[PDB]
């Protein structure tokens, strides 16, 4: 009753602080970009008298609508390819059960919305057992690798607490290279994103936030290799279980900090 | 090891089946839609001879360069509202720590992307601490309300397992009216969405999927009331805990089905 109110106050303060920081970091640039395209549009109207202000704003608005829906407004004909072909439909099904939900592909039909509701109600807990199994498989593999070292070093194990500590340290160090650093390097070369855009995609994907602004394997102008789609699929599958384990440890550290605050305030 | 492979096979089959169903339900409708920006752009060039193809291409490319990083909900891109005013920046901060991430508002700047990475790393576990407390608060409140029912159930010599099952189903039934049915009725009248679109929004939001195709409080053409934004904020906050408890019960039902 009192602990839940204390954490609610901390979360509200964290949200207000975050809102103030994100506004200071984004609003002046957004205001600069809004006036920048506004002046270019106003000059376009005086250079091209045959076009009226509404006529131009209709095409510009529709160009933005097509771009945000996956169809590039640059070039002669884009053909729009297919968002619901068996391959992309399988990947869409994954964005639902994993709770990432990029939103680049989403059901328009009534049948798709009805099926999506039931698909997430039974699929999300089903994926959670696979994620618990993968986390256990990773912990058992890392536990075996630490037990082999403790056998060759001739150290007597009083309890599996020493193995648990060493395996958590090696897990977050090695796992950061395998699921965070190396993938971002691949995304920089394949997608052509910046070093920051690539690392921003990894965190947003593995934390299940999935804004949809950056999606690996979604550029029509890029001919992706045969191994690329299944590699990203396997990276999300295991990388979600890695990030969930790291975020669980961070949650424990915050719970430990709460007991220190309780003791100091008492 | 063998258990993990068995669940992986089930998940892959569930994904392939889902892919086949979503393709059959969406691909024929997608193939029917012939409206494209390429034909509208080609017609624009013949209607306005004073503009050349490269002159139009230049303005269209610059419009995309000046566009926000977020993809606005379906049918709400011509709003031109400030995506980063204190109010909508507070709501954006919520989409990160709750893991919903609609993506209607998203950081374009380098400073925003760096801060968003650290904001998610420390904010998501912080919100989890709160969600655990809210789930406990819901369980205690429900437990107090059902204590009269459990007293009558215990009087008639009913086993403690039978009482546990009936109580959990009553949590889903009352909780569905409070966090699923009543909110969807409000979204139908306020947003003007269909009965299905409103229920589709609720499930996608409370399961933290958050596609971004439907966002409550994102229509420029609708003048929202003063109480609307904080009501949706409070519904998301406590509704996530109810849905996490329900999804946990669904997982238990699947484990029971496995023993059968």
């Amino acid at each position: 009753m009192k602990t839940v109110v204390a954490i609610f106050v901390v979360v509200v303060v964290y949200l207000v602080t975050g809102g103030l920081v994100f506004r200071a970091l984004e609003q002046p640039f957004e205001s600069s970009q809004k006036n920048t395209i506004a002046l270019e549009k106003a000059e376009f109207l005086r250079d091209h008298v045959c076009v009226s202000p509404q006529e131009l704003e209709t095409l510009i608005q529709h160009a933005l609508d097509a771009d945000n829906a996956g169809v590039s407004p640059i070039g002669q004909s884009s053909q729009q390819s297919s968002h619901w072909d068996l391959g992309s439909a399988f990947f869409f099904a994954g964005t639902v059960i994993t709770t990432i939900g990029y939103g680049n592909i989403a059901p328009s039909t009534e049948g798709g919305k009805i099926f999506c509701i039931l698909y997430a109600i039974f699929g999300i807990p089903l994926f959670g057992f696979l994620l618990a199994g993968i986390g256990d498989q990773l912990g058992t593999i890392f536990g075996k690798s630490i037990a082999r070292v403790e056998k060759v070093f001739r150290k007597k194990q009083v309890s599996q607490t020493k193995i648990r500590v060493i395996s958590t340290i090696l897990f977050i160090l090695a796992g950061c290279i395998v699921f965070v650093t190396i993938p971002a390097v691949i995304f920089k070369y394949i997608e052509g994103w910046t070093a920051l855009e690539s690392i921003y995609f990894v965190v947003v994907t593995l934390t299940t936030v999935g804004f949809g602004d950056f999606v690996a394997g979604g550029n029509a102008g890029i001919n992706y290799r045969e191994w690329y789609k299944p590699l990203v699929w396997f990276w999300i599958l295991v990388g979600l279980a890695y990030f969930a384990a790291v975020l669980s440890m961070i949650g424990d550290w915050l719970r430990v900090l709460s007991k220190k605050t309780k003791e100091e305030v008492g | 090891m063998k258990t993990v492979v068995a669940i992986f096979v089930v998940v892959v089959v569930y994904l392939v089946t889902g892919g086949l169903v979503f393709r059959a339900l969406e691909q024929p409708f997608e193939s029917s839609q012939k409206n494209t920006i390429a034909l509208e752009k080609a017609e624009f060039l013949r209607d306005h001879v004073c503009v050349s193809p490269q002159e139009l291409e230049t303005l269209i490319q610059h419009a995309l360069d000046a566009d926000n990083a977020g993809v606005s909900p379906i049918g709400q891109s011509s709003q031109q509202s400030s995506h980063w005013d204190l109010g909508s920046a507070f709501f954006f901060a919520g989409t990160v720590i709750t893991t919903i991430g609609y993506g209607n508002i998203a950081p374009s700047t380098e400073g925003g992307k760096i801060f968003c990475i650290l904001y998610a790393i420390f904010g998501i576990p912080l919100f989890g601490f709160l969600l655990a407390g809210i789930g406990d608060q819901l369980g205690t409140i429900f437990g107090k309300s059902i204590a009269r029912v459990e007293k009558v159930f215990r009087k008639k010599q009913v086993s403690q397992t039978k009482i546990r099952v009936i109580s959990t189903i009553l949590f889903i039934l009352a909780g569905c009216i409070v966090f699923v049915t009543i909110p969807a009725v409000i979204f139908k009248y306020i947003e003007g969405w269909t009965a299905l679109e409103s229920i589709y929004f609720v499930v996608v939001t409370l399961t933290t999927v958050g596609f971004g195709d439907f966002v409550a409080g994102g229509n420029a053409g609708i003048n929202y009331r003063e109480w609307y934004k904080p009501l949706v904020w409070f519904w998301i906050l406590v509704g996530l805990a109810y849905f996490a408890a329900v999804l946990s019960m669904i997982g238990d039902w699947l484990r029971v089905l496995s023993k059968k």
Partner: nanobody
Amino acid sequence: QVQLVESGGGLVQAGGSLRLSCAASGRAFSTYVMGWFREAPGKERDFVATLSRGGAVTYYADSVKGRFTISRDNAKNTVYLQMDSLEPEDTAVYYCAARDRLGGAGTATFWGDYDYWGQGTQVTVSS
């Protein structure tokens, strides 16, 4: 499904002692975070004590700190709760709980933080 069975409660006079035990089934007890909760009649289940997977990190509620002691024996799949200096306020049904999810070492103080639960053991302290 993991089964938790409690034993060792009863009725004692104020100031006396008790020792509860909770036996678990399966061969993964050493991987669970064990905890004790108590349900007073008409009151919600409150946190009593929690213990890390090995047993080296203990955490207690302010009402039972200095009087109660949580311990574990992974060899016998059992978690214990030694209750010294019992007060009439400690009269409740005590529940044993196991957490197989990662973490929880001293921080698992909510009922929702656990995955498996016991039947409950009655503890009564009279004036």
